[PDB]
Subunit: 243 residues, 3 copies
Amino acid sequence: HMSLVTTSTSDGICTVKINRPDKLNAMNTDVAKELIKTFEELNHNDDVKVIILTGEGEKAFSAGADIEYMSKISADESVEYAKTGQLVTATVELVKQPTIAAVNGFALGGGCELAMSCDIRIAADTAKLGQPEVTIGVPPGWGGTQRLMRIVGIAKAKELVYTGKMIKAEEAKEIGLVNHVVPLASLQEEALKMAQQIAGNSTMGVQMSKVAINKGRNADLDTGLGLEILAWRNCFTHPDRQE
Amino acid sequence: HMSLVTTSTSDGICTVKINRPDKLNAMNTDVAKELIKTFEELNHNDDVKVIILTGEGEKAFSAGADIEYMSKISADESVEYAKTGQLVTATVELVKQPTIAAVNGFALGGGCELAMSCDIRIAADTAKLGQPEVTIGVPPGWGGTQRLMRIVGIAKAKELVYTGKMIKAEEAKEIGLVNHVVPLASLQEEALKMAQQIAGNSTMGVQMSKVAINKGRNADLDTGLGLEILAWRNCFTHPDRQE
Amino acid sequence: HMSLVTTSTSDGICTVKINRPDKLNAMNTDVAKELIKTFEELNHNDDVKVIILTGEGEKAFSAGADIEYMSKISADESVEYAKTGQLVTATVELVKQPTIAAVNGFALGGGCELAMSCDIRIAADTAKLGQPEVTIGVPPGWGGTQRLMRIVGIAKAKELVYTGKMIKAEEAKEIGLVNHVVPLASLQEEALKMAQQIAGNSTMGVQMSKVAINKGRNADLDTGLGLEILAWRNCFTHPDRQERMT
């Protein structure tokens, strides 16, 4: 259902690949439940420095809009349907090590919506991003009603959700949907390139900033400063700074 | 000072025009209270499903910045002038149906503040968006110091208001003040074409998204995730989910 | 360790110049306290209208990330350094007068946080805008974590903080954390030209926009309209409402 490998200098980089290329890397309850335990529910081990995640099959990231169609059931279970979706993204969002997202082609419905849970998005030149959902009859509910608001601003947020169309990776880069663009033949080398750069830094300095940056976004500027200092001193209790 | 037309497919486009081609469709007390009558005090007819708006004459969308000032008396009377403008912008922002700001040229001051209340804004190559205000001697009162900050971000509203310049179309899309700078003239030919795509999808997938997106524009992410679930579940108890 | 040099049309334009070229205008506690105890007087001097803060010549703003690095106290006075660091970056932001940073070259570390605290920041293509804090263990303590996020976006704020790379300031214009671009002869012309573009407007209009922009961003829109209307009114009891609408 999935695959993962760990490899770097001193074994500090690991990748997670969604293994369903026969079904356009679609995500269901079975796959989404395994990804929750893959990241170990907000705390990984000691070995890894920074994680990478992407889709296997070279075609799409997770095109859960053309093949993923099963909701003909009672609306009561939609609460649990749109709660394991939030569970995986939040686990992706607040996992202890940073993750660099690597969009490989199409990402629609929830696959793109899962991509918004990460830190850095390295894009393939053949990507086709969007939030279709609405054309079926249901809005996004896997977390995306407040991600596009937080990444690309609100001006571009109300566009891709109301329409459900698709825009090019270049346009996605223009609005900030994907941070950087690399060619499709230079993805599984440049995705690590950022990670092979990210790993040779302080082991605690990176993840301490993650807490100080993923907790002040909900609060204001003033309260975040008090939150910021608690993580600033948390570094000074660890000898990575001293050497 | 208004007109209603519905010439379109799906019988649901209700673009609103300001019938003052002799004063650049400026804004005052007279027109402002009539906009509520058009938008029917946070309600609208069922037949209309999506909406756009523009300025009549293809010369100015709304130029209520410097040609139509009337505040030189009773600083205690200029609390209703802002509150009326607050009411008109809040009404247009949270309409039942989505909007498209089709700027046909000028949009400044209280006029651009009307364009800034839209969700999707498609611009014109001859646009002259800007917030002089401070040159007049006023700090923007109809959401100019809030709407502009939450749209183009915090770093590009501190120059538009401090200097009070008229930026052109090319530097308006450059930051996110307007989603698209598509033709000034095909704004009618393309926004209805854009709208017919918006209305080509399920309606409850559109307006229930508007409730979730608009409310969570300043709340925390987890609470915003609380907002979406009910709206997500609202789209599960309607005939617009199965068929 | 600095100079005022204030001139304009009916002189009201301030260009405060940090003076320490020997160590690339290093950002230590003395200069982290020198700028507070003059901008307060600048906060208390109503004649001056526009403020500019920068270096003095042609090299760089401030390299307080890898030049001066004093981290040895037993974690107890590091909180004071954070409290001192936060305070120095909270007075420039909330000073009475508009701040045009007009960054000049290397802004990494203390200079970068200080630059982003300003309202309007010009940036070069030769200028360096990046945070190398993480590579030496510490996060950006003076507000790097939550000032980078709000300005450009959380998606791009993490990348510069995590990698700790020195992106060329030309990318920063496309990135979005800086304002304008023009070739390197004279920052003293265009930065101070736009200062006249500010000095030529109402003195209290920007401030009632400044103390309404800096507050309504945090809370929800309905609360933000509070300061929004309580600041629009204040520019009306003042005579400047009835002298420029003529």
